[PDB]
Amino acid sequence: VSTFPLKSDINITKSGKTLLSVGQGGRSSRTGFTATVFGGTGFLGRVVVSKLAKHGTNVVVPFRNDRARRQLKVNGDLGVVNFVEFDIRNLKSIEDSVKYSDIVINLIGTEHFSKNFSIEDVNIGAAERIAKAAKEAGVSRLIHVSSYNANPSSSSDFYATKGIGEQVVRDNFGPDATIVRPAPMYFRNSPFLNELLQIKALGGNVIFKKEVYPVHALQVGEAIERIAFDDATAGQTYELFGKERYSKKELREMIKHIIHIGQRGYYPYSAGFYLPAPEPFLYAFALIRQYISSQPRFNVDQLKRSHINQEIDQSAKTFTDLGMVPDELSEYLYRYVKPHISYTSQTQNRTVYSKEDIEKLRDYVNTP
């Protein structure tokens, strides 16, 4: 956020351009930069595009969904946000997105596969194509966002493709490409917290045992802003994670009390809060819905990843290398699960869980 995201009013890109900034940093100001955010209509793109457009950075947002892009225009002043209809199977549209940008941010990536795109097409084929198209267009900075457990030799088809995608981005764009490895991100409408906030979660006895180091999505969006506007971060890999380690079983049980579903001794068990299932059934059901359901459900690869915990690459850089302190999930967990609290609505008295109260609740959850 801040009031002006730059250390100076003059910035010479590594491509040779000199970009001046005007204004004090409001909506009417400009930074002189043109950025392209691939995957801007997604969960993280809306955070990133909003932070760039609010300070006057011209953002090119290539879209495939016409309805999802409309809310992005509100973030910036007139002419700041620009849309290009595109497809990763179309090369002319990809070049048009990066033709004028000085920064290219790649947020395109899926944990699923569909009738049209496999995990290899998106996490590798798209990332490689975008990196090469960026280089031929003279883009000074490339930022590629992989996952937290990226590994070219992983048993998970998502972790493997994310790890290989890191390699191909550097092999095309060159050694100066920056790589970000966010942990599971929590925010409003967060894919990480949405599965924990769902009631009828089938096979949670297997799925919810994975441990992670969740990180605030606003900080990940803030960190990417720091990286793009500081050329000392080129060629670097950043592992953005929170200080504390949680298992999805803990958060699932901590959320239950905040939602007050446990007010009744019978209701959570009757409503389907716990849905134990043998892993072969979880495999078959995930496999079956992969060719019957039209919406991306819990697939086979996510079942495998439920066993693999998050491993922090120690050779990579952290939030402290960017001069930022990670946020604590304890200080943000309530306000992001607040919409899901059942009665609330100033009935008698709200139970606002402070940061101290969340940690007290965590011990009670872990007490048998």
Binding site: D66, E85, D87, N90, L91, D157
Partner: protein, 175 residues
């Protein structure tokens, strides 16, 4: 984990129909688009003198009801938000809350200079300089006020864009 992606596949808005399912989801899209265009239910949100011209569209001379256009009091029954009047700082949170309560799909029409960019009250301490600082806007109708025909033309532009929707073929060909 190798991959091979095509390079010359056109975008959704320019992609021709090749197989049977391209026609099937196009037919599925057209019927839903036809209904939403035909049942054009704006929300009663007349703020200022731009509302008078919006009331004259429902008047017998123009009679929007003949096109299937019915004004709804509740945001739940509405899919179009027509901002007809000046949006003040005191009203902006209420306007955003009212917009957020519309079930999807929802469109917003900005009518008149006040809603477009502030208009006569652009340099006022208590006026929002354009409703598109608070909500996404799909079409902008100019005038102070826009005539009833100018508003009807703006609606016809939105109905034209609604008839080009490809939501179900987007699932088939882009997802």
């Amino acid at each position: 984990y190798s991959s091979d992606l095509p390079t010359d596949i056109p975008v959704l808005s320019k992609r021709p129909h090749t197989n049977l399912l391209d026609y099937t989801f196009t037919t599925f899209d057209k019927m839903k688009n036809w209904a939403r265009k035909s049942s054009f239910w704006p929300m009663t949100f007349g703020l200022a003198c731009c509302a008078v011209e919006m009331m004259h569209v429902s008047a017998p001379r123009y009679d929007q009801d003949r096109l299937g256009i019915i004004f709804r009091a509740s945001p739940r029954q509405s899919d179009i938000m027509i901002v007809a009047g000046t949006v003040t700082n005191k009203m902006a949170p209420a306007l955003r809350q009212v917009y957020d309560q519309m079930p999807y799909p929802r469109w917003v029409i900005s009518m008149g200079s006040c809603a477009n960019g502030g208009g006569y009250y652009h340099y006022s301490y208590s006026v929002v300089r354009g409703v598109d600082r608070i909500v996404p806007v799909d079409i902008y109708v100019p005038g102070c006020p826009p005539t009833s025909e100018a508003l009807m033309y703006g609606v016809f532009q939105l109905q034209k864009k609604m008839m080009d929707g490809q939501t179900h073929r987007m699932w088939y060909r882009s997802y």
